[PDB]
RNA sequence: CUAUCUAGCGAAACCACAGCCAAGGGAACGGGCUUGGCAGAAUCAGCGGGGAAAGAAGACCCUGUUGAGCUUGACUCUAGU
RNA sequence: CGUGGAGGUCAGUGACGAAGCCUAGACCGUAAGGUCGGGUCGAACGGCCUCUAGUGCAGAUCUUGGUGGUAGUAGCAAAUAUUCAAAUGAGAACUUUGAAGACUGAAGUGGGGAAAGGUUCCACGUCAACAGCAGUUGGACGUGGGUUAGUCGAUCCUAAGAGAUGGGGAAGCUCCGUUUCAAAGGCCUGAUUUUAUGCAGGCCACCAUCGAAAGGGAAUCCGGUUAAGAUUCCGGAACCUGG
RNA sequence: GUCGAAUUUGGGUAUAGGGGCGAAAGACUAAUCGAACCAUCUAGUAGCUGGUUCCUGCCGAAGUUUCCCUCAGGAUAGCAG
RNA sequence: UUGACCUCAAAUCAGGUAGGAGUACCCGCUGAACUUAAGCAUAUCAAUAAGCGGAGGAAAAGAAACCAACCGGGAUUGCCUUAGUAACGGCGAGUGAAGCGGCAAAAGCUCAAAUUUGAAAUCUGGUACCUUCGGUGCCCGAGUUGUAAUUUGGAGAGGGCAACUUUGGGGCCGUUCCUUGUCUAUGUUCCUUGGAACAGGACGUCAUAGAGGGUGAGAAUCCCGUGUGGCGAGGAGUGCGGUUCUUUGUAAAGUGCCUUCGAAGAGUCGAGUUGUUUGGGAAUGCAGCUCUAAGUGGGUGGUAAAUUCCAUCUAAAGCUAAAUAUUGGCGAGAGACCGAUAGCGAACAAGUACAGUGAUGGAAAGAUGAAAAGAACUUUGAAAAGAGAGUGAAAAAGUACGUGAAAUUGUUGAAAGGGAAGGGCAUUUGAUCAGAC
RNA sequence: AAACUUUCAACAACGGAUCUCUUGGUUCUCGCAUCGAUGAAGAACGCAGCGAAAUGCGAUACGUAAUGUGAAUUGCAGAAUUCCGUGAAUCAUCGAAUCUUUGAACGCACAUUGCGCCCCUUGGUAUUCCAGGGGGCAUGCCUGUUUGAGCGUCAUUU
């Protein structure tokens, strides 16, 4: 049970906040857990995903398929992965959307701010 | 892309003026070559760059007159505070802290004494 | 207060072969000419609009609240009644169930849970865990989504970390002997709830 | 209209009485708001007890002349009798009534000894002194029933 | 009328710009519900009253 | 020129359920009830006997402690003078 | 008996199919109703003890929506009238072209405008809908193009009128009143060419303003030109006002 | 019928609801006039018309008294549960 | 002649300010009628709706020209209570207060009327500088028809005696409050069904975290959050807790006894009459007229008047938090509320489309699928489309899309039918069927 | 005997009920006090590479500047260096700005996109005429200033 007086247990507001969330806040919403190998190596459990990581699929029909993120389609609350597509009847390939909570990061895209984010959360590099 | 505002601050008013009329020319041939080709999203960058140049120009003359009117009353009305019509008309703290000697003497002599009650 | 009255409709009267209900005037919009103001009309005001002066709270004699709380307290020591409420107390050594005061000074939830199991609350706790269901009606999306049974009521005489030990344990409530809620001591007006007394709590009843 | 054997009733509901209807659904809400402002002031004035020493006063209106009750102020004769100035007493948690006049000695001396007991049990701190903490109580009416 | 004030011709230009069907690509947008132009007006059906 | 027949297009009023009579009785003038006469699919163009046909909660009459327009030495007032 | 919702309990049913819907299939109850089987469907829902109410429909010329018989019926008949052939097309009584026969008959079924409309104008493509038959056509649909002025108007004046101001009423939104018990305004010429206009002067007494695309009023004609504009463009030839 | 004028008519303008305008019909004042239209008071009041929703079980009437600006209504006694 | 005063002007003179919007809640002003009275006119709705003026975060009121008759109380506001009472009232219908007692909150007060006269000491504004919600220097002006100092009835002022006691401002760090940022646990282990596990079964882990939401189905442990704490950033100022600098001041306040005084408000109070208003009765307030005082005076003391007493306050002048109100604005938390004809008129490009000259009037309309994977390709057709093929868990999901009722309709099957049909009891016949063995 | 009519079933229609949902409404509680002549509310017209509307904005026009976060936006096209970054975003925040024409609306007007005057400057051989750019020109009222009017009035003269 929640103890704050500034926290709402309203289903209508929780649904509205997610669906009308701005893009900057959607970045935190689309966070992917790290792998067992990276979790012990960094000390972080989950991070906000970005475009250049490669993840692993642990749920859905695409389980066991590795691939590097192709786009973080924040409008659709989805993440696309290369080499994970469905080929249409007319020889055309379309990406299939994946939710990051069903993905497992296998190596982060290390930048200056992503590194700085690591020490901020207590990561050990 | 476009122009960087922090680069425009270094140049003087004469260099910005040339750049503004330089950008005005450039946007003019973009409009002329847009009517032939189907789409041209580059006109957006030039329009914003002109706006950035104009804005950085504006602050240079606006600060020039703040320093000209620095350290005196009667600032230009567009450079004063825009707090609120009611608040701007509101009495200052000096004019709201004026007190009569009859109360000034009483404040000095007899303030509320901080008292506790245990024993 | 105005819903179903925010128009200017009037009756057309007789001779026009239509019913004498007031009807929206004007023209050109499809809403005009239609019934208004009635408890039968679409878009009217519903019959006897709810007002809030309604009597929500009900005042109960002080002596009766004291009478009923003593009855639901005396009914906690009847294993026949506690079993009827389905509290899984077949393996309890004896009731009332009184434990040493050292339960009152437990901080971690995991310690408090294992304390209840060893005392005999294992079966009752698992019943709450496996009873979680969705609400049947429209109450799901009125912030009443899930439903479960109610487990043991732990009552203390002092609070040194016990109210927050069982704060996250489903079906478990923590209480003080001074307060002794009747809603907790006979849920659904059904007597005989399973209650764990501390040694200090049990002594304070006299 | 009039009917079976019933008392007459005067029910005053022929105005538009439906808009001037109060149902304080706030009874519990106002109570908590009172108890914050009651403590928020108590922090700001920290040592003081949130109220003035009020006197003991015999009620009017022979119906109630038989009991005694808290008054509004200390009847300048009283504050001068106990040896203190009104302008200063108002800074010491004494409520003084410039418009009440003493007329009964047994009532009169009761306020004097009330005010004398008050002076002994209070601690006034210097305007420039250390002002040690003194474990406030929140009511003079409680301390002097 | 032929002779007209600038208010009238200015407000007719507004009504001439707005007279065409829905852009085609808008119905291809994510979470789109607009199926056509519900404010389309023709000179033979309803009058502008300007 | 219609009506008529054809290709195309294509409504509305109205409709408890419906549609053969005689007499009877019956809310004192039945399509239905009783006793009789009778009674054969599906139908077309006409017709104005009937359906007390349709069109309107009778505008006449009366009732209502329901009105309004108007009048006057009605009652009670009032602008102006 | 049934319905929406609430407290309790059946550690109740359920994606191995909840709820709903359909079923001259079965069972229970006097009945309200309850239960089962089969089909369809896809995510929630019940038994029992209690609590609560925006809780049960055949009708109110009930409300909103939907649908019939009537019925392939009434009808699609005012305004003199069509016909032959070719072209196009899947398709021609209706489109285009030609021919023939007719009509409006100059207070026209012709050529221009005012009010009104607003793109209906013109080109290209095009017929799902609209043109109460049709449609290849259209004032429809989709996409575009098109309105060029010193001289034509407005713009100026005033009319019947409207209406600020100085004031006077009115609690007040506002009313009166347009020269009224107003210190009501501005033009010519000088003087100095530290020079702005102070200063020489005289003159003037009316008096805000709005109000007519048919009243009053400075001045442009011809020829040519576009798919669509012209007293406006082009060529030529003019006039007026101001400086 | 009238058809050179008490003629016809456009545009402007004035006159606004117990008010206008009327060669006078209670006519006209936006298909509305013997008091326009719009919103609000307003869910205006009705002794009058119409309707008023599930089952079974048990009981079971009245149209009569007196008073009432009382006679299509109430109060009252009686009948009923 | 020249220089003033009074009064009145002018200027695109220097600096400002009012307007308008919104208006739920407040302060006034104006003001109905519908209705009830079983009619109706006084009465009631109602001192209300509509109309007008004027504010705030609350407003307004507010420190007695009060209440009371007590053993007196002591600003105002609000609650409970007094009380459906005293009283009013075609004494009918009906209306209808306040004192007293408990609680919330509590806070007080200041102007006029006085010669500083051994000294306009005062205040605006202008200009220069400076540490600018401002200070200082200088200069016109306001101002003797009174601007500063001094005191407000509870007092107080001018003198005499005696002596004491008590004091201001500027920097710094914290604290308080507000806004805001960041960090802070535990499975995605195995088997089955399923398109998808978020389901069922086994085994665990965390819990001051089993609120809520998301992800392909009911997820404490997959994600965001949640719980408990930690660490930052920007703002308000004295509300205060410490550090420090200036000594304000040859100043101010309080206090005992004696003496002399003690100014306290006018076209105002008050009275008559009229009207309206009230619960206010031989007149509750208010306002109109006419009359219009006073100083041991005057106002009040709820039956008019004359006479004698007594009680309590100080008007014609003024400021003031909190307790109270709030369908408007902003930001939140909720519900035994409604669920697309319901709930606001409006879940959607709704005050929109649309109607009228106008003022105004005003809808309809949510749901494919987890994912468009929105049907490639062949074939018939002028085309729309059809038939195959395909996607999808499902086209009994094809943008006429969840499910998909009834009225009404087509096709197939069965049966009956001489001017209706439908119904009841009973059985024949045909079809179908449960039980029991 | 067909047809036709009627009844029922299956399948297919018409229609949009029911069932299950819900970024909506409604009601209650809590906290706060903040429009406008330094130009409000409102209105008109415009602005995107491709928008009619809604939403956003104003000729600097789905926006500029500043701060934070830190890699997207997305229907298509395009741009990539801006990706260990003084830096993407239809991001949040927002303290600097722009803010067309109006509007209490203010030079005079307004059913006109009508008509003047003043100040500085530029061009046409120009204080005067025409044009351009920039700044102005409403009313009531208060305080101050300056030029004044009145045998209203004092003093002083000659």
From Swiss-Prot, chain A:
Q: How is the subunit organization of this protein annotated in UniProt?
A: Component of the large ribosomal subunit (LSU). Mature yeast ribosomes consist of a small (40S) and a large (60S) subunit. The 40S small subunit contains 1 molecule of ribosomal RNA (18S rRNA) and 33 different proteins (encoded by 57 genes). The large 60S subunit contains 3 rRNA molecules (25S, 5.8S and 5S rRNA) and 46 different proteins (encoded by 81 genes).
Task: Keywords in alphabetical order, please.
Answer: Cytoplasm, Ribonucleoprotein, Ribosomal protein
Q: Name one Pfam family in it.
A: Ribosomal_L26
The keyword Ribosomal protein belongs to this UniProt entry's keyword annotation: yes
Q: What's the miscellaneous note?
A: There are 2 genes for uL24 in yeast.
**One GO molecular-function entry:** structural constituent of ribosome
In terms of PANTHER family, this protein maps to: 60S RIBOSOMAL PROTEIN L26 FAMILY MEMBER
Q: Subcellular localization, per the record?
A: Cytoplasm
The processes (GO biological process) annotated in the record are: cytoplasmic translation; ribosomal large subunit biogenesis
* InterPro entries, per the entry: KOW, Rib_uL2_dom2, Ribosomal_uL24_CS, Ribosomal_uL24_euk/arc, Ribosomal_uL24_KOW, Translation_prot_SH3-like_sf
Q: Name the species this protein comes from.
A: Saccharomyces cerevisiae (strain ATCC 204508 / S288c)
Give the NCBIfam families listed for this entry: rplX_A_E
Q: What is this protein called?
A: Large ribosomal subunit protein uL24A
- Similarity-based family: Belongs to the universal ribosomal protein uL24 family.
Q: Which PROSITE patterns match?
A: RIBOSOMAL_L24
Q: Which Gene Ontology CC terms are recorded?
A: cytosol; cytosolic large ribosomal subunit
> Would the keyword Methyltransferase be found if you checked this record's keyword annotation?
no
Curated annotation (Swiss-Prot), chain B:
Compartmental location: Cytoplasm
- UniProt keyword annotations, A-Z: Cytoplasm, Phosphoprotein, Ribonucleoprotein, Ribosomal protein
Q: Which BP terms in the Gene Ontology apply to this protein?
A: cytoplasmic translation; maturation of LSU-rRNA from tricistronic rRNA transcript (SSU-rRNA, 5.8S rRNA, LSU-rRNA)
Return any one Pfam family short name: Ribosomal_L29
The highest taxon in the source lineage is: Eukaryota
Q: Which GO terms describe its cellular component?
A: cytosol; cytosolic large ribosomal subunit; preribosome, large subunit precursor
Where do the coiled-coil regions begin and end?
none
- Which family is this protein grouped under? Belongs to the universal ribosomal protein uL29 family.
Q: How does it assemble?
A: Component of the large ribosomal subunit (LSU). Mature yeast ribosomes consist of a small (40S) and a large (60S) subunit. The 40S small subunit contains 1 molecule of ribosomal RNA (18S rRNA) and 33 different proteins (encoded by 57 genes). The large 60S subunit contains 3 rRNA molecules (25S, 5.8S and 5S rRNA) and 46 different proteins (encoded by 81 genes). uL29 is associated with the polypeptide exit tunnel.
Q: Which HAMAP family match?
A: Ribosomal_uL29
| The protein's name | Large ribosomal subunit protein uL29A
| Organism in which the protein naturally occurs | Saccharomyces cerevisiae (strain ATCC 204508 / S288c) (Baker's yeast)
Swiss-Prot record, chain C:
Provide the primary localization.
Answer: cytoplasm
Q: Which GO terms describe its molecular function?
A: RNA binding; structural constituent of ribosome
Q: How is it modified after translation?
A: N-terminally acetylated by acetyltransferase NatA.
Keywords, comma-separated and alphabetical: Acetylation, Cytoplasm, Methylation, Nucleus, Ribonucleoprotein, Ribosomal protein, RNA-binding
Q: Name one GO cellular component term.
A: cytosol
Which residues does this entry mark as bearing Omega-N-methylarginine? Answer: 42
State the Gene Ontology BP annotations: cytoplasmic translation
Described function: Component of the ribosome, a large ribonucleoprotein complex responsible for the synthesis of proteins in the cell. The small ribosomal subunit (SSU) binds messenger RNAs (mRNAs) and translates the encoded message by selecting cognate aminoacyl-transfer RNA (tRNA) molecules. The large subunit (LSU) contains the ribosomal catalytic site termed the peptidyl transferase center (PTC), which catalyzes the formation of peptide bonds, thereby polymerizing the amino acids delivered by tRNAs into a polypeptide chain.
Subunit structure, as described in the record = Component of the large ribosomal subunit (LSU). Mature yeast ribosomes consist of a small (40S) and a large (60S) subunit. The 40S small subunit contains 1 molecule of ribosomal RNA (18S rRNA) and 33 different proteins (encoded by 57 genes). The large 60S subunit contains 3 rRNA molecules (25S, 5.8S and 5S rRNA) and 46 different proteins (encoded by 81 genes). uL4 is associated with the polypeptide exit tunnel. uL4 interacts with its chaperone ACL4 and the nuclear import receptor KAP104.
- Which gene is the coding source of this polypeptide chain? RPL4A
Swiss-Prot record, chain D:
Subcellular localization is given as:
Cytoplasm
Query: Which terms does the record give in the GO molecular function aspect?
Result: RNA binding; structural constituent of ribosome
Cystine pairs annotated here are: none
Q: Which GO terms describe its biological process?
A: cytoplasmic translation
Q: Name one GO cellular component term.
A: cytosolic large ribosomal subunit
Q: Which UniProt keywords apply?
A: Cytoplasm, Phosphoprotein, Ribonucleoprotein, Ribosomal protein
Q: Which residues carry this modification: Phosphothreonine?
A: 143
Q: What else is known?
A: Present with 133000 molecules/cell in log phase SD medium. There are 2 genes for eL13 in yeast.
Describe the task this protein carries out: Component of the ribosome, a large ribonucleoprotein complex responsible for the synthesis of proteins in the cell. The small ribosomal subunit (SSU) binds messenger RNAs (mRNAs) and translates the encoded message by selecting cognate aminoacyl-transfer RNA (tRNA) molecules. The large subunit (LSU) contains the ribosomal catalytic site termed the peptidyl transferase center (PTC), which catalyzes the formation of peptide bonds, thereby polymerizing the amino acids delivered by tRNAs into a polypeptide chain.
Q: Which family does it belong to?
A: Belongs to the eukaryotic ribosomal protein eL13 family.
According to the record's subunit comment, the protein's assembly and interactions are:
Component of the large ribosomal subunit (LSU). Mature yeast ribosomes consist of a small (40S) and a large (60S) subunit. The 40S small subunit contains 1 molecule of ribosomal RNA (18S rRNA) and 33 different proteins (encoded by 57 genes). The large 60S subunit contains 3 rRNA molecules (25S, 5.8S and 5S rRNA) and 46 different proteins (encoded by 81 genes).
> What is this protein's record name?
Large ribosomal subunit protein eL13A
């Amino acid at each position: 049970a929640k103890q704050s007086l500034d926290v709402s247990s309203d289903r209508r507001k929780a649904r509205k906040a997610y669906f009308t969330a701005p893009s900057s806040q959607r970045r935190v919403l689309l966070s992917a857990p790290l792998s067992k190998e990276l979790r012990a190596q960094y000390g972080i459990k989950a991070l906000p995903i970005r475009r250049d990581d490669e993840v692993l699929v642990v749920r859905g029909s695409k389980k066991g398929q590795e691939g590097k993120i192709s786009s973080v389609y924040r409008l659709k609350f989805a993440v696309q992965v290369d080499k994970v597509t469905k080929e249409k009847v007319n020889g055309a390939s379309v990406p299939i959307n994946l939710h990051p909570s069903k993905l497992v990061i296998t190596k982060l895209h290390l930048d200056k701010d992503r590194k700085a984010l690591i020490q901020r959360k207590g990561g050990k590099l | 892309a476009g122009v960087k505002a922090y680069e425009l601050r270094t140049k003087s008013k004469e260099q910005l003026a040339s750049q503004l009329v330089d950008l005005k020319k450039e946007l003019a041939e973009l409009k002329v070559q847009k009517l032939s080709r189907p789409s041209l999203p580059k006109i957006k960058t030039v329009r914003k760059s002109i706006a950035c140049v104009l804005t950085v120009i504006n602050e240079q003359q606006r600060e020039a007159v703040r320093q000209l009117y620095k350290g005196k009353k009667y600032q230009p009305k567009d450079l004063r505070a825009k707090k609120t019509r009611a608040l701007r008309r509101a009495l200052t703290k000096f004019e709201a802290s004026q007190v009569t000697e009859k109360q000034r003497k009483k404040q000095i002599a007899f303030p509320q004494r901080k008292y506790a009650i245990k024993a | 207060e105005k819903a179903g009255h925010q128009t200017s409709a009037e009756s057309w009267g007789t001779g026009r072969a239509v019913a004498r209900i007031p009807r929206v005037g004007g023209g050109g919009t499809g809403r005009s000419g239609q019934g208004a103001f009635g408890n039968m009309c679409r878009g009217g005001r519903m019959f006897a609009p709810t007002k809030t002066w309604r009597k929500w709270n009900v005042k109960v004699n002080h002596n009766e609240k004291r009478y009923a709380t003593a009855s639901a307290i005396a009914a906690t020591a009847v294993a026949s009644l506690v079993l009827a409420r389905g509290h899984r107390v077949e393996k309890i050594p004896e009731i009332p169930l009184v434990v040493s005061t050292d339960l009152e000074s437990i901080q971690k939830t995991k310690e408090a849970v294992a304390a209840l199991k060893a005392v005999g609350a294992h079966s009752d706790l698992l019943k709450v865990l496996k009873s979680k269901k969705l609400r049947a009606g429209k109450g799901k999306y009125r912030n009443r989504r899930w439903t479960q049974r109610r487990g043991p009521l732990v009552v203390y005489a002092e609070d040194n970390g016990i109210v927050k030990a069982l704060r996250n344990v489903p079906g478990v409530e923590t209480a003080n002997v001074a307060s002794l809620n009747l809603l907790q001591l006979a849920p659904g007006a059904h007597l005989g709830r399973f209650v764990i007394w501390t040694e200090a709590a049990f002594t304070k009843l006299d | 209209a009039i009917s079976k054997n019933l008392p007459i009733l005067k029910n005053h509901f022929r105005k538009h009485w439906q808009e001037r209807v109060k149902v304080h659904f706030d009874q519990a809400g106002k109570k908590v708001s009172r108890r914050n402002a009651r403590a928020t002031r108590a922090a700001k004035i920290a040592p003081r007890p949130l109220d003035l020493l009020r006197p003991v006063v015999r009620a009017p209106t022979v119906k109630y002349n038989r009991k005694v009750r808290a008054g509004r102020g200390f009847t300048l004769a009283e504050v001068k009798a106990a040896g203190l100035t009104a302008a200063y007493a108002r800074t010491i948690g004494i409520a003084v009534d410039h418009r009440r006049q003493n007329r009964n000695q047994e009532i009169f001396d009761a306020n004097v000894q009330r005010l004398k007991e008050y002076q002994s049990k209070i601690i006034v701190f210097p305007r420039n002194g250390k002002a040690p903490e003194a474990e406030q109580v929140l009511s003079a009416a409680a301390t002097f029933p | 009328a032929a002779q007209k004030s600038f208010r009238i011709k200015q407000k007719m230009a507004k009504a001439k710009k707005q007279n065409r069907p829905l852009p085609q690509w808008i119905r291809l947008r994510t979470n789109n519900t607009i199926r056509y132009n519900a404010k389309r007006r023709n000179w033979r059906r309803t009058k502008m009253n300007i």
